[PDB]
Write a protein that binds this ligand. Structure first.
Ligand code: HEM
Ligand code: HEM
Ligand SMILES: CNCc1cc(C#N)cc(OCc2ccc3c(C)cc(N)nc3c2)c1
Ligand SMILES: CNCc1cc(C#N)cc(OCc2ccc3c(C)cc(N)nc3c2)c1
Ligand SMILES: CNCc1cc(C#N)cc(OCc2ccc3c(C)cc(N)nc3c2)c1
Ligand SMILES: CNCc1cc(C#N)cc(OCc2ccc3c(C)cc(N)nc3c2)c1
Ligand SMILES: [Cl-]
Ligand SMILES: [Cl-]
Ligand SMILES: [Gd]
Ligand SMILES: [Gd]
Ligand SMILES: [Zn+2]
Ligand SMILES: [Zn+2]
Ligand SMILES: [Zn+2]
Lengths: 401, 402
């Protein structure tokens, strides 16, 4: 059992939960790859079983009357049609567990408070879109953001899946140019490439909210326009640097990742958008300052009058920090939920403490838990971590096109 | 089987073939990753030796005829009459550079070619030891124009005790225990400060009192030695615009010189082989000055900046840390003492990875330690995928001789 130590505290735990890691990671004793971004009836049955026992154990029905009944209900259902159906409650449990087991998420102390939308009765593209709109609106809540997931029908033998061709529900457009540059978010060119050619008249703004590409089974994907009152945005200003507002920057309220596949007791859900609220550094450092994102660092450095000719002026660091201050301030001023990296990591340490008492440990990925700036300043930096894979889980899947 | 690794800024993909020669084992399995953990005989002595010789002869291209199979059979034979063998001085230099070349956690390996290897294998006592060390410091400091160096004292061998340096670094500041629970000076060094005194040292009462050296000869107790004050180049810390900074009274030494690691070459072990480079500002700026249990001047600096330290979302911690790093960088350049910032350090490491990929088909790198402790994603190494593993020759950790 792994001996993990908090070097700022000198305290020790043993990760006993790691011993149950359902799958295998990419590391071996020969070489570690923990920095890599992307590492059948009896099969479905054994996964189904392991999950249903995990549910009844969680609710303390270990060996109960109602316990042995559901087991053979699944045994029957799977025996009859290979695949099987999740009870509503089993599905809510699945959604929370998957969030909870996500090793790269720093906001897991909120895992028990998640709202699950059951859209498993969905039938078409138009019906998907409505369900999404109710999601975006429930979850935005006029700025007071709330965590939620919307699950669509599980996968079925010999048939096209429901998919969301958008990586997030709200993504800005990315337009190529005559001089090969890019207008907008360049991470989203591949999907603007599509939406435009899927029947969408394109803008030219740096911050054009993309339409939703939604796909029903077999009868191919179908475009959808978002109502602009559904999509809450924050204009970005800085608390003492009056010129920052004039850069014309903004970001959206709602981090809503869609293109991941949810897996619960052997059932795979190709479409299941989940959303929380933003950590400041994701907007400040990754979205605005990354070289192949919006890449504003230098522009801001120039306006602060910093020496951009020499790395030793640390202009990059100085600019980056004030870009993060602008983000927080802008969100607070607009009363839209936001968390800074110090508050985030501090709550995560509390989470490790919780998980230690509750489950014997916690799957955490150090390289993603540590924030993109001021790493050593946060308390997760000097905390040793163990990464592994549990079920239920969120997985990646091939780009649906 | 080849580990496919990608640079996510550029989009470039390489295959780390070198990882296949992974000598040791790490703490990771497919069950779980432990990559964030800080700390994880004639027959096989000969197998280690053989592999080492085959590296060294392949180095100078001429490999597989001359004194190669000669040296092998010579080494294979030298183990027979004795057990332990001895390196050709050119083999020592080669292995010395290799051990730097191989260290997965050092962002400064662009320079591994230019290292000055001092052969102190004929060293005989604690006093000659001290003399080699003063010379090391003298050459490496070079009035502020720093040069990479390493001095190799005699290998561990049966029937003799070890040469050992008890200090973790050649230059370190003392750390006294006050009555009020606080520590005057560097808290990291309370232990070694305890020992120095118990072994006769008459201590100081300053926050930057340079420590003596405790030097150990085989089967002999460690002897105490004061570095001559004019041998230790120190830098006063001041901020290029914040004039009140200078009244914090801070300084750091010029030369990072780690003295407590084991050097392993071709099965042979050099428990005493101190090596030094030059600082990267973040080590001094963030780690030594801002860490809670190091010198811990962050809140203190923040208040003087009239930042709002009552709330995390003001980012007072980040703001104060950046100016502390600016002070370090500016002070070192003022003093004409060699230093390097994390943007420069990392950009060169990216070039190193390009060299190493062409040279050896890979490069052992520990992501969590290469990525600077502030502004991670502002540097190119953040978005570069890496493969961590153990190759020999190597610098290794070893027990405190007490
Ligand atoms: C409510 C507050 C939340 C916060 C503050 C938060 C924060 C974060 C952050 C900072 C990351 C790192 C992302 C990166 O570096 O790319 C992350 C990843 C992740 N989070 Fe959370 N998140 C929240 C809600 C949620 C919810 C509601 C779910 C699922 C139901 C979730 C599951 C995940 C997953 C699966 C990842 C890994 C995704 C990937 O790396 O592709 N989180 N989160
Ligand atoms: C010349 C300029 C050099 C720079 C800028 C540099 C920089 C660094 C840094 C920043 C670290 C990480 C330390 C930490 O985060 O605590 C490191 C680790 C390391 N470096 Fe250096 N270094 C230099 C020279 C050298 C030389 C000459 C050697 C050996 C001959 C060396 C060997 C090592 C080793 C073995 C480690 C890992 C030690 C450990 O993990 O405990 N470096 N280096
Ligand atoms: C650029 N990094 C690689 C990357 C690629 C993709 C893809 N394709 C998705 C990624 O998900 C990060 C993520 C996911 C969900 C989040 C939620 C719910 C809340 C929150 N605050 N932050 C979140 C961050 C990250
Ligand atoms: C947005 N998709 C394209 C893209 C663009 C840019 C740019 N410019 C950078 C990207 O890096 C993804 C990435 C790669 C490695 C990471 C590691 C080791 C750790 C970590 N915490 N996050 C990481 C994120 C991806
Ligand atoms: C807190 N870190 C744990 C730690 C433990 C041990 C042990 N045992 C050794 C460590 O050496 C880091 C190091 C080593 C050599 C360096 C050289 C030559 C130059 C330079 N600029 N920085 C360096 C940093 C760090
Ligand atoms: C007790 N020794 C002194 C000491 C003091 C403090 C304090 N305050 C912190 C210490 O941990 C260093 C450490 C721990 C984990 C690290 C990880 C995962 C990655 C990385 N790049 N560097 C790391 C450095 C050590
Ligand atoms: Cl995002
Ligand atoms: Cl140091
Ligand atoms: Gd101006
Ligand atoms: Gd001033
Ligand atoms: Zn690993
Ligand atoms: Zn990034
Ligand atoms: Zn530290």
């Amino acid at each position: 059992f792994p001996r993990v130590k908090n070097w700022e505290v000198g305290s020790i735990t043993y990760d006993t939960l790691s011993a149950q890691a359902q799958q295998d990671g990419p590391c071996t004793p020969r070489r570690c790859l923990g920095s890599l971004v992307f590492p059948a009836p009896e099969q479905l049955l054994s996964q189904a079983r392991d999950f249903i026992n995990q549910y009844y154990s969680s609710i303390k029905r270990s060996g109960s009357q109602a316990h042995e009944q559901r087991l053979q209900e699944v045994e029957a259902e799977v025996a009859a049609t290979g695949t099987y159906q999740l009870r509503e409650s089993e599905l809510v449990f699945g959604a929370k567990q998957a969030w909870r087991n996500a090793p790269r998420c720093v906001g897991r102390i909120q895992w028990g408070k998640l709202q699950v939308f059951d859209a498993r009765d969905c039938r078409s593209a138009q019906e998907m879109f409505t369900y999404i709109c109710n999601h975006i609106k429930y979850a935005t809540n006029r700025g007071n953001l709330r965590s939620a997931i919307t699950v669509f029908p599980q996968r079925c033998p010999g048939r096209g899946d429901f998919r969301i061709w958008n990586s997030q529900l709200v993504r800005y457009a990315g337009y190529r140019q005559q001089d090969g540059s890019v207008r907008g978010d360049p991470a989203n060119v591949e999907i603007t490439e599509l939406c435009i050619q899927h029947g969408w008249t394109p803008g030219n703004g740096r911050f054009d909210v993309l339409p939703l590409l939604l796909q029903a089974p077999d009868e191919p994907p179908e475009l959808f326009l978002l109502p602009p009152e559904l999509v809450l945005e924050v204009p970005l200003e800085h608390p003492t640097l009056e010129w920052f507002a004039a850069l014309g920057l903004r970001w959206y309220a709602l981090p809503a990742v869609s293109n991941m596949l949810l897996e619960i007791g052997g059932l795979e859900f190709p479409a299941a958008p989940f959303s929380g609220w933003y950590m400041s550094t994701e907007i400040g450092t990754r979205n605005l300052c990354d070289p192949h994102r919006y890449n504003i660092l230098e522009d801001v450095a120039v306006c602060m009058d910093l020496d951009t000719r020499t790395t030793s002026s640390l202009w990059k660091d100085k600019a980056a920090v004030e870009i993060n201050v602008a983000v927080l301030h802008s969100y607070q001023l607009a009363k839209v939920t936001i968390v800074d990296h110090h508050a985030a990591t501090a709550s995560f340490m509390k989470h490790l403490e919780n998980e230690q008492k509750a489950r014997g440990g916690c799957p955490a990925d150090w390289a993603w838990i540590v924030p993109p700036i001021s790493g050593s300043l946060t308390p997760v930096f000097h905390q040793e971590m163990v990464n592994y894979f549990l079920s239920p889980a969120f997985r990646y899947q091939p780009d649906p096109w």
